[PDB]
């Protein structure tokens, strides 16, 4: 088999191959993960470079792994297919064993743990992938999102954005978000995500995705509407 | 496991499954439900060789989940016993062999259809209006063949049901301590909790 | 053999019979047929002794791993699980295996699962397992109620034992017993079925058909 | 040892770019322009042979256009011996899943298990990518008429209109410029030749230089005809589009 | 058809007392009717202070031991040569014989020495590696006859205290190895006398803070 | 230059400049000290500690009851190399009953290393070894190279300076030969050797490493104060 | 290119030489041990205030009587603190004991060396593992990339390294008790560190005989910070 | 598994005061027919052991196949092979004591009994049992199949316990084993007349007797036997 | 016990006059219960039928396996397969089985589209061809089949006569088998129309 050291050191201590995984991270569509008291929501960038296109059947940016859990992602996004797939295995074998669902961090760990082992396996290049996991613990009303990236370090974050332009939201998400007290309802939660990409987006027609995630699997896709009735309550606002 | 049967009428498929478990010489448990969830319109009932039953069911269970996620999409009755039947085709010339007969009970969503399909532990698979495993039929089948109406309401099909469990405690020598109903309908799965 | 668990208001109470034969031929009285997984799991032994307590040691090695990793007391669901989706990959091997796992947590309560070598997992509230489980099973279906208090709970349980110990000629020796707790089991010390027969038969009453 | 000669054919540039995956799109756009078209009643697939012959026997030939069920179908831009290997697998798949399933395979899942196998071979294995891009054209009951694409990279998107291969983008800014939603086959057939006429390399647009096929439901009642168009027919539709 | 096990005969005897403890066994050794050895040792010194008998086919028997006495070797190889404490002693064994536990060593195994305590220790282990700490274990050939007497002499069953008639039992005093050895004499003398393949010779190991002493024995040889 | 990028590659000279690299390892390692007598066989090695709040690092390895070895240069490759020695000589007393030759040692070590400079991918130990033992031709010393070249000698050094402690063991070689039934004297004269490979250091009680083997000997390892007896 | 198994003319090993400047960029990490026991503590280092400092998770349990601390590229350390906790655990198994701190650590390092053309190359980070066992009482190891473990009284790991390790170099002695160790991992840690040191950036943990390994509160750690500020203040 | 085909019978061997005795005779039975008459059953490797083997006869040339490599093997890069680093007989037995046990765990057994009688480098007398099980013991005398139920009788006579050994000597040995193997040939169906014999002395080496016969017969007596009961 | 009369059923097959028929019960059974009355064990690849008996789960496996197969084959070779091309297939897949084979008795019938002739096969279990002129039975009743055949068959029937004699064959054959019957099917086939006829009988 094809066993050649693709990920390796550098002189400086760095490994390229990991660092040009997160690259293709950079050049990816901006996704925002943003959780309030009660909800967590995951906005997306589409890029309106790519019209005619079926917005049916495309690939959706937010992925369900389990009924209580989603994956949004920035980068490659055949790589992230495979993440995706791993995830959902897991989540079903998790339940089989344990008889549990997953909690939102063991199921990080786990896509976290896949992506570093292809960071130091042989006749393999790292995952051009970063992704952000939300959901609820089985159980639980907590809000959970985590990130990960290709070099399989994990963490949880208040409020994160991946992809390109990121520094600029997520700038944003640092004067915007107050920790003390985040977004009380699904309203205010959603209206600051969709403000966070305004600030990268340039259009708010059909560029902007919202998934609201709340507790016990209630997971629902805003539509096109929807969401431009929080681009035109915004930019009202903005009139002033 | 002993008496699985099914019923399939107008509206709705009925699943009744005995609710004892014996080990040999004593009765461990007298309300064991041998049955599980596969999609939000499909159930399926099971009878056979201890720990090969839960172990094959809990199995399928998994894989129809997984399916559901992966496409957000719940597959039909048919789809769902024909996987079934394939893993049962497969295990019968395995090194060990799952012992486990099963009945499905789905409602269709996009044909508005009850469907009833009977597998044993060889991939023998066949559609029933009204279905059994072991030696149930022998009992049920004849009176079955005398009442059964496709167009039967869900109340009538519980009391042929009644019947046939009647019949079942008079006749057979073992005690199966009664069983479990449930109903699979539009609106997806209920158990009757007096029976 | 005899071994029983039950679960009640104030947890689970397990007791166990201490004789081991190999034919006729009593090997020993002092066999601890209670199995302690962890401070929080015990398991009983039933069947192949070996088998008992090899895997449910291992079964002890892989609840620690799990709250290791987890950072969490693991389930008795999650725990039974283990062991018989274990045993289930050695079945027609001819392991020999019947046991209650028994556990109480937060989220589950108090817990036993009779898990058994062909395979089986059984969730329930009253098990008993062996050659003499016919005269336990007796005694315990006509004096269990949920409400017992821990004392008479423990009693019954021992009075269970003694009643296989006197019939089953492969029962016998001492009893042991434990009463599990949220917090943990609680040893509840060995009991030898010859003096514990006559106490019992002078303050209970009971075996008049025996000479004391 | 062996390492001195290995190009390495799975890694990222400085830039985050897979070398091969990059080299074989700038492979495929000197291919055969394919296009699809999805209409209300139907799917159009159109798409150019490569400088041919006269003594090319085209009644027999396919290079292009190729059948993986009778639900679906692909066309090709790109190494057509790349795309026959990938072609016989997504058809043995298609008959996995009508084996397992007792049900024709949904067109996602298809495309997505191709697409899969493509992602693979640029992330591990150290072999070259396969040199193909497809246009997908099927129907099932849950999405009816779908049109999609898949390139060497395994990323795969859906279309109302697309094209691959030589001269993408006056294809498709074309079809975007005629492209409407209340469009029908015929309507759809007239916009791909079109299209075909303005983008081709060649001096004119002749029926021996063309492969067409269309998806129909235009199958007596409630089913779906696969069409691939003969050499005759493909010439008749030339004439009656007013092209020749 | 080839059977891959036998029965080589043999008794052994392993008594825990209050800081020592004693493994003993005839050295006998047979096949069916007939005498391989008048004196084929059969108990063991393993080292740190362990001493061994795996009794029943001895071929299984000879295996274990060396696999074990190996396995103490490689414990000081990779632990710092740490001593391996008689409780760790007894559950690697386990292991080793559960290793085979679809084909396994046909033996009866006893180990005994002292604890981490210093108090006496004996550990019994089955064909397929159960094992328990235990006061007082006879294995092998006379293991039926030799236990009820243990029952009686060691752990006083059976004997009440006289006058009070049943009411009082009789006291669980401690017995000095010298004692022990008496028991374990006659308990072979007795078996020699009622076992065929009980005879020859009786060897004892004494296991005590000091070490391991060994104590030999004439039984008869008929 | 263009030849040294693996182990599978001469040069133009016909030498193997990674075999040449892993012996470059061994000359950055700590000093240590092998000689013997004909009763008895000594090592004594100096070990070295990262700084002054750690360890000394372990230099002597025990192979079996007879044999042992002292290390220098990659740690990691001494423990492969001593668990194979661990293993061979138990291989030789399960299956035959005999304890291993000490000379045979040496050619199975030889034969392990030589593996590792003739196939591509892996690379050559990075560690030198002196082993002692004691079998039935007496004691014995032997020298090991990464190269795989062995060599059986009355006294030796490898490692950093070693070739101070190595002169003076070639002019000692008469007198330290004949120290036979006398372990202290035997040590004494090893000490002193390692004593002349050592500069601006000195030997102290957590510095000093030694081992010996005999007759009426098994193989020990004496450090702590043990070794200050000495000093 | 070259073998990632390659010698330097020098004598080591490129892939190792290389990892070991990937740990020098960690995040600092220091361990003192103590007669009473060992202390451990890091530096969390958050890239960003929306990152939820307590989800970084640089000191680990191993077992009971064994705990661990990480720098460098932490992701590599997973597999490692994996395979140490399942050593740990398999020896109880296997032998009813608690397994030693040593033999531990030799078995995380026998991991270290298995790369080539295993694993494709070295772990990028470095390991503080600390613990008690019986035979020889409260220990710190430093397991290193290159397979070689060192004990340590004390020891600091990561980009402020050099500079604590003089610091700890001045500052143990063999009669330090528990609370001094603490504030004195606290102090090097607020000196080496870029950002003011307080209960969210960092956290402490420690092995005892008693009570094993304990990874400690913010609200402890917050009290211990604050009894360094007033004692430094206080000449 | 197997079955024995062509097959030895009987081994017998004792110890004396400074050295051991080994015979075994020369027959190769396959089945009650006797089919070869002079096959060799004690196979001497080097000086100081001689290893005799009865049973299966095509598993034993394999074992003296494996003799004869262990011996070149021993030389290979060896300077002290014919000295110090000789083979001993006890690492000649637990070698084929090793190879036994790992057959039979197997469940393919090698289908014999060997002694390995020997003197060690030290003088010590070495004389051990091994089987198709892996069955290991040691005894004053030592005897397989037949022999062990008649030949040690009579060889434990002469040397009944361990403190026997001493007090007897090379001719009152030699004498026991040759009266021994009269009886087999006496009382046992597959055996035969001549046999070979090895003696091993601490001081005169290894002494191997080739084409030794049975002699000194009782047969006389047989003329007055008639009938099986009142004929006359 | 035997695998091949667990479930019970026939087949049977004749050629007529530019056409073949082929029919089979509907009975599917464990042992001695009736469990389905509509189990047909006839299938059709493009233009070609497969008959099936023996046991039920085989039957099923079969039929999708050579369904897959002459997809496949119709992809590739941009054509139907035909019957003597299918009967090769079903030996090769059958004998590739040799040591734990299919417990089935199939048979085929189809007309060649090319040549237009009549063309019927049986095999065994492990794919040896019985390819016939006048007939083929398979099943439980195949030696009341082979007693009904041998008698009321003659070559050259008109495919109006052919039915009648095929059906008297099947009914009659089965009615003296207690696991064949509940049931029969018979497919008429000519070069370019089918008729299938399901055959009203005793439900004993
Ligand atoms: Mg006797
Ligand atoms: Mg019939
Ligand atoms: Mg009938």
Redesign the interface.
Same mark, same amino acid.
């Given at each position: 088999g094809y066993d050649r050291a693709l990920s390796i050191f550098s002189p400086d201590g760095h490994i390229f191959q990991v660092e040009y995984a997160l690259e293709a991270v950079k050049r990816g569509t901006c996704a925002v993960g943003v959780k309030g008291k009660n909800c967590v929501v995951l906005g997306c960038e589409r890029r309106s470079t790519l019209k005619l296109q079926d917005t049916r059947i495309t690939p959706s940016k937010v992925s369900k792994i389990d009924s209580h859990v989603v994956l949004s992602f920035s980068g490659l996004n055949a790589d992230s297919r495979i993440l995706i797939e791993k995830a959902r295995v897991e989540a079903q074998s998790h339940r089989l064993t344990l008889e549990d669902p997953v909690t939102v961090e063991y199921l990080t760990r786990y896509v976290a743990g896949v992506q570093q082992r292809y960071t130091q396996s042989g006749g393999v290049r790292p995952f051009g992938v970063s992704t952000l996991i939300a959901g609820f613990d089985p159980r639980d009303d907590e809000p959970k999102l985590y990130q990960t990236e290709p070099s399989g370090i994990y963490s949880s974050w208040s409020a994160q954005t991946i992809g390109r332009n990121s520094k600029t939201v997520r700038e944003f998400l640092e004067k915007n978000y107050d920790r003390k007290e985040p977004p009380a309802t699904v309203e205010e939660c959603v209206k600051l995500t969709v403000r966070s990409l305004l600030e990268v987006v340039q259009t708010g027609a059909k560029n902007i995705e919202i998934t609201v995630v709340k507790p016990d699997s209630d997971i629902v896709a805003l539509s096109s509407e929807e969401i431009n009735q929080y681009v035109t309550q915004i930019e009202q606002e903005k009139q002033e | 496991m002993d008496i699985i049967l099914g019923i399939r009428v107008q509206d709705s498929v009925i699943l009744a499954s005995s609710k004892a478990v014996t080990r040999g010489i004593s009765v461990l448990k007298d309300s064991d439900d041998k049955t599980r969830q596969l999609s939000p319109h499909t159930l399926m009932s099971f009878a056979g060789e201890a720990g090969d039953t839960v172990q094959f069911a809990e199995y399928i269970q998994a894989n129809i989940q997984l399916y559901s996620i992966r496409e957000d999409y719940e597959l039909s009755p048919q789809a769902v016993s024909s996987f079934v039947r394939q893993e049962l085709a497969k295990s019968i010339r395995s090194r060990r062999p799952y012992q486990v007969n099963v009945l499905i009970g789905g409602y269709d969503k996009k044909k508005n259809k009850p469907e009833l399909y009977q597998i044993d532990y060889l991939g023998t698979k066949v559609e029933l209006p009204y279905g059994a495993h072991g030696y149930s039929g022998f009992y049920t089948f004849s009176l079955l063949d005398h009442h059964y109406r496709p167009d039967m309401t869900t109340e009538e099909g519980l009391d042929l049901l009644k019947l046939c469990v009647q019949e079942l405690e008079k006749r057979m020598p073992m005690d199966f301590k009664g069983v479990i109903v449930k109903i699979v309908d539009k609106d997806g799965i209920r158990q009757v909790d007096d029976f | 053999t005899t071994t029983l668990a039950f679960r009640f208001q104030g947890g689970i109470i397990v007791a166990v019979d201490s004789r081991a034969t190999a034919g006729n031929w009593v090997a020993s009285q002092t066999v601890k047929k209670v199995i302690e997984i962890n401070p929080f799991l015990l398991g009983t032994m039933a069947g192949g002794a070996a088998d008992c307590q090899f895997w449910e040691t291992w079964l002890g090695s892989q609840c620690r791993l799990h709250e290791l990793r987890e950072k969490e007391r693991i389930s008795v669901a999650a725990a039974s699980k283990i062991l018989s989706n274990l045993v289930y990959q050695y079945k027609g091997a001819g392991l020999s295996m019947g046991t209650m796992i028994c556990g109480y947590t937060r989220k589950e309560g108090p817990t036993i699962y009779y898990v058994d070598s062909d395979g089986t997992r059984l969730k329930g509230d009253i098990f008993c397992v062996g050659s003499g489980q016919t005269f336990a099973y007796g005694v315990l279906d006509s004096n269990y109620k949920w409400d017992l208090s821990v004392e008479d709970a423990l009693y019954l349980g021992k009075r269970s034992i003694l009643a296989a110990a006197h019939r089953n000629a492969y029962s016998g020796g001492s009893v042991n017993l434990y009463h599990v707790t949220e917090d943990g089991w609680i040893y509840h010390g060995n009991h030898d079925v010859g003096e514990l027969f006559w106490k019992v038969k002078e303050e209970e009453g009971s075996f008049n058909n025996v000479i004391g | 040892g062996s390492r001195r000669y290995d190009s390495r054919t799975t890694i990222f540039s400085p830039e985050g770019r897979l070398y091969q995956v990059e080299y074989a799109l700038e492979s495929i756009s000197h291919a055969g322009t394919a296009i699809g078209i999805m209409a209300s009643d139907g799917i159009v697939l159109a798409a150019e042979r490569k400088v041919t012959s006269t003594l090319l026997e085209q009644d027999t030939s396919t290079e292009k256009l190729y059948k993986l069920n009778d639900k679906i179908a692909v066309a090709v831009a790109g190494l057509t011996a790349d795309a026959e290997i990938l072609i016989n697998t997504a058809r043995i798949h298609a008959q996995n899943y009508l084996k397992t399933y007792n049900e024709d395979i949904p067109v996602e899942i298809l495309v997505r298990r191709l697409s899969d196998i493509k992602q693979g071979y640029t992330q591990h294995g150290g072999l070259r990518p396969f040199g193909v891009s497809f246009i997908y054209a099927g129907y099932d009951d849950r999405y009816g008429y779908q049109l999609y694409t898949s390139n060497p990279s395994g990323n795969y998107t859906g279309w109302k209109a697309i094209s691959v291969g030589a001269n993408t983008s006056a294809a498709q800014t074309l079809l975007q410029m005629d492209y409407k939603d209340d469009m029908k086959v015929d309507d759809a057939i007239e916009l791909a030749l079109k299209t075909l006429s303005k983008t081709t390399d060649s001096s004119a647009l002749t029926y021996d230089r063309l492969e067409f096929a269309t998806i129909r439901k235009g199958a007596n009642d409630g089913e779906v005809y696969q069409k691939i168009f003969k050499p005759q027919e493909i010439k008749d539709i030339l004439v009656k589009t007013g092209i020749t | 058809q080839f059977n891959p096990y036998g029965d080589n005969g043999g008794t052994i005897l392993g008594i825990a007392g209050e800081d020592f403890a004693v493994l003993a066994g005839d050295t006998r050794n047979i096949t069916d009717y007939s005498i391989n050895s008048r004196y084929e040792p059969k108990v063991f010194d393993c080292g740190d202070n362990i001493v061994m008998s795996a009794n029943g086919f001895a071929a299984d028997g000879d295996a274990l031991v060396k696999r074990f006495k190996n396995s103490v070797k490689w414990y000081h190889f990779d632990h710092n040569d740490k001593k391996l404490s008689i409780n760790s002693a007894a559950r690697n064994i386990q292991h080793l014989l559960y290793g085979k536990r679809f084909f396994p060593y046909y033996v009866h195994t006893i180990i005994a020495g002292l604890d981490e305590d210093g108090k006496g220790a004996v550990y019994s282990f089955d064909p397929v590696g159960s094992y328990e700490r235990e006061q007082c274990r006879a294995g092998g050939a006379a293991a039926s006859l030799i236990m009820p007497f243990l029952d009686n002499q060691v752990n006083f069953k059976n004997q009440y205290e006289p006058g009070t008639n049943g009411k009082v039992k009789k006291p669980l005093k401690y017995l000095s190895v010298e004692e022990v050895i008496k028991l374990v004499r006659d308990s072979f003398t007795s078996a020699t006398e009622r076992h065929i393949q009980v005879g020859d010779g009786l060897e004892i190991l004494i296991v005590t803070k000091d070490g391991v002493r060994k104590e030999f024995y004439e039984l008869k040889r008929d | 230059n263009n030849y040294? #990028?693996?182990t599978?590659t001469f040069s133009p000279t016909g030498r193997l !400049? &990674?075999v040449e690299? @892993? *012996?470059?390892?061994?000359? &950055?390692g700590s000093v240590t000290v092998g000689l013997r007598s004909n009763t008895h066989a000594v090592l004594v090695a100096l070990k070295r =500690? @990262?700084?002054? %709040?750690? +360890?000394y &690092?372990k230099k002597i390895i025990?192979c079996d009851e007879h044999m042992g070895l002292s290390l220098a $240069? %990659? @740690?990691?490759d001494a /423990?492969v190399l001593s668990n194979y020695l /661990?293993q061979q000589c =138990?291989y030789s007393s *399960?299956? !035959? =009953?005999?304890k291993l @030759?000490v000379? /045979?040692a040496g050619?199975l070590l030889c034969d392990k290393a030589q593996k590792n400079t003739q196939s591509? $991918? #892996? /690379?050559?130990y990075?560690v030198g070894l002196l082993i002692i033992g004691y079998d039935? +031709?007496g004691a014995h010393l032997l020298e090991f190279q990464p190269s795989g070249n062995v060599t059986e000698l009355y006294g030796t050094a490898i490692g950093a300076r070693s070739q101070g402690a190595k002169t003076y063991l070639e002019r000692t070689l008469d007198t330290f030969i004949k120290i036979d039934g006398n372990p202290d004297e035997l040590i004494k004269a090893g000490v002193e050797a390692i004593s002349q490979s050592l500069r601006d250091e000195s030997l102290t009680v957590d510095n000093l490493s030694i081992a010996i083997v005999g007759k009426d000997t098994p193989f020990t390892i004496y450090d702590g104060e043990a070794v200050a007896k000495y000093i | 290119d070259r073998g990632v198994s390659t010698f330097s003319p020098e004598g080591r090993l490129f892939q190792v030489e290389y990892s070991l400047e990937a740990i020098k960029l960690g995040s600092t990490a220091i361990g003192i041990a103590t007669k009473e026991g060992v202390v451990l503590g890091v530096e969390k280092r958050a890239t960003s205030p929306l990152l939820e400092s307590d989800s970084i998770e640089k000191i680990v349990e191993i077992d009971r009587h064994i705990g661990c601390a990480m720098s460098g590229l932490t992701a590599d350390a997973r597999s490692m603190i994996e395979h140490a906790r399942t050593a740990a655990v398999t020896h109880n198994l296997y032998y009813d004991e608690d397994i030693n701190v040593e033999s531990l650590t030799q078995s995380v390092c026998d991991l270290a060396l298995r790369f080539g053309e295993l694993m494709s190359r070295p772990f990028g980070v470095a390991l503080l593992i600390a613990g008690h066992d019986a035979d020889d009482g409260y220990q710190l190891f430093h397991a290193e990339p290159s397979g070689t473990f060192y004990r340590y009284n004390a020891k600091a790991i990561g980009s402020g390294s050099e500079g604590a390790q003089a610091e700890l170099l001045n500052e143990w002695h063999s009669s330090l008790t528990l609370k001094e160790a603490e504030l004195l991992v606290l102090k090097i840690l607020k000196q080496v560190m870029e950002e003011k040191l307080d209960e969210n950036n960092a956290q402490l943990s420690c092995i005892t005989k008693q009570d094993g390994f304990k990874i400690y509160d913010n609200e402890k750690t917050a009290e211990l910070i604050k009894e360094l500020k007033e004692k430094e203040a206080a000449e | 598994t197997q079955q024995p085909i062509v097959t030895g019978t009987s081994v017998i061997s004792m110890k004396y005061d400074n050295g051991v005795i080994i015979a075994a005779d020369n027959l190769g039975s396959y089945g009650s027919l006797l089919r070869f008459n002079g096959v060799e059953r004690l196979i001497p490797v080097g000086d100081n052991t001689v290893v005799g083997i009865s049973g299966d006869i095509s598993d034993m040339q394999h074992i003296e196949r494996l003799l004869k490599d262990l011996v070149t093997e021993n030389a290979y890069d060896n300077p002290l092979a014919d000295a110090e680093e000789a083979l001993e007989p006890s690492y000649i037995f637990e070698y084929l004591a090793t190879v036994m046990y790992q057959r039979r765990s197997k469940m393919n057994p090698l289908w014999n009994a060997i002694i390995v009688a020997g003197v060690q480098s030290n003088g010590d007398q070495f004389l051990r049992y091994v089987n198709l099980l892996g069955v290991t013991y040691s005894s004053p005398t030592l005897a397989t199949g037949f022999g062990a139920h008649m030949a040690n009788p009579l060889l434990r006579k002469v040397v009944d316990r361990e403190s026997d050994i001493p007090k007897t000597t090379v001719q009152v040995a030699e004498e026991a084993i040759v009266n021994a193997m009269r009886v087999l040939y006496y009382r046992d169906a597959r055996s035969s007349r001549n046999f070979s014999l090895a003696i091993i002395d601490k001081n005169t080496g290894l002494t191997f007797k080739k084409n030794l016969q049975v002699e000194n017969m009782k047969w006389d007596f047989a003329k007055d036997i008639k009938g099986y009961g009142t004929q006359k | 016990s035997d695998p091949s009369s667990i479930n019970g059923g026939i087949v049977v097959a004749m050629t007529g006059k530019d056409c073949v028929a082929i029919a089979c019960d509907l009975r599917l059974g464990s042992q001695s219960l009736g469990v389905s009355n509509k189990f047909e064990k006839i299938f059709h690849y493009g233009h070609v039928f497969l008959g099936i008996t023996g046991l039920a789960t085989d039957v099923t496996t079969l039929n999708e396996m050579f369904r897959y197969k002459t997809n496949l084959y119709k992809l590739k070779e941009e054509r139907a397969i035909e019957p003597e091309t299918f009967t090769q297939l079903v030996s090769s897949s059958l004998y590739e089985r040799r040591f734990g084979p299919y417990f089935v008795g199939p048979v085929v019938a189809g007309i060649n589209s090319k040549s237009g002739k009549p063309f019927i096969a049986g095999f065994d279990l492990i794919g040896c061809i019985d390819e016939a002129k006048d007939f083929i039975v398979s099943g439980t009743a195949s030696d009341q089949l082979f007693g009904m055949c041998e008698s009321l068959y003659e070559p050259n029937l008109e495919p109006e006569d052919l039915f009648e004699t095929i059906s008297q064959a099947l009914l009659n054959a089965a009615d003296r088998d207690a696991l064949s019957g509940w049931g029969a099917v018979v497919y008429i086939i000519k070069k370019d129309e089918v008729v299938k006829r399901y055959l009203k009988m005793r439900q004993d």
């Open positions: - | - | - | - | - | 040294d #990028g693996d599978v !400049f &990674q690299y @892993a *012996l470059e390892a061994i000359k &950055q =500690n @990262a700084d002054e %709040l750690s +360890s &690092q025990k $240069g %990659l @740690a990691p /423990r /661990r =138990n *399960l299956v !035959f =009953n005999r @030759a000379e /045979r050619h591509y $991918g #892996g /690379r050559p990075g039935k +031709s | - | - | -």
